[PDB]
Amino acid sequence: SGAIYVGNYRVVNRHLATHNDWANLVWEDSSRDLLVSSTTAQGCDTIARCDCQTGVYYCSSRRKHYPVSFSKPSLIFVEASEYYPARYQSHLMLAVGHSEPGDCGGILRCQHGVVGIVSTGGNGLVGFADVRDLLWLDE
Ligand SMILES: COc1ccccc1N(C)C(=O)N1CCC[C@H](C(N)=O)C1
Ligand SMILES: [Zn+2]
């Protein structure tokens, strides 16, 4: 679990969004596994606007933060699951690191701010749904 709270927006994994998230839907993209809902209170997270390929992510299955090198946002194949059929997930960045089901929502951050959230993994890899292109999150 996990979310980014920026301004009057809450950013979450689309496969973990609540009834409330869908009742206050602003935007969603199944191909990116992202969903943005509106909030009444102001959020105090800063979004990074950069091309960093190094950062630190929170891994709830280890209660630890890990430094990682990660790929550029791209279309990557993701095995079928209870929420999606087998498909290409866009805007996804992979790193070598620990992740297991339950780690989705953990924030990835670089020196400039929030980069994205854990969305995929397996076999010593972890995938992050990028949010740095969503410029509207700030205006
Ligand atoms: C951190 O995630 C993992 C870790 C280890 C092993 C597997 C995972 N994966 C990949 C997932 O949990 N999922 C299932 C829920 C839907 C996700 C998606 N974006 O399509 C993929
Ligand atoms: Zn950065």
From Swiss-Prot:
Q: Which residues form the active site?
A: 15, 33, 104
Quick one: which residues bind Zn(2+) 1? 50, 52, 110, 112
Report the catalytic activity.
Answer: Selective cleavage of Tyr-|-Gly bond in the picornavirus polyprotein
Q: Which domain of life is it from?
A: Viruses
- Report quaternary structure and partners: Homodimer.
What is known about what this protein does? Cysteine protease that cleaves viral polyprotein and specific host proteins. It is responsible for the autocatalytic cleavage between the P1 and P2 regions, which is the first cleavage occurring in the polyprotein. Also cleaves the host translation initiation factor EIF4G1, in order to shut down the capped cellular mRNA translation. Inhibits the host nucleus-cytoplasm protein and RNA trafficking by cleaving host members of the nuclear pores. Counteracts stress granule formation probably by antagonizing its assembly or promoting its dissassembly.
- Name of the protein in question: Protease 2A
Give the organism the record lists.
Answer: Coxsackievirus A16 (strain G-10)
Relative to the complete UniProt sequence, the shown stretch is 869 to 1007 of 2193
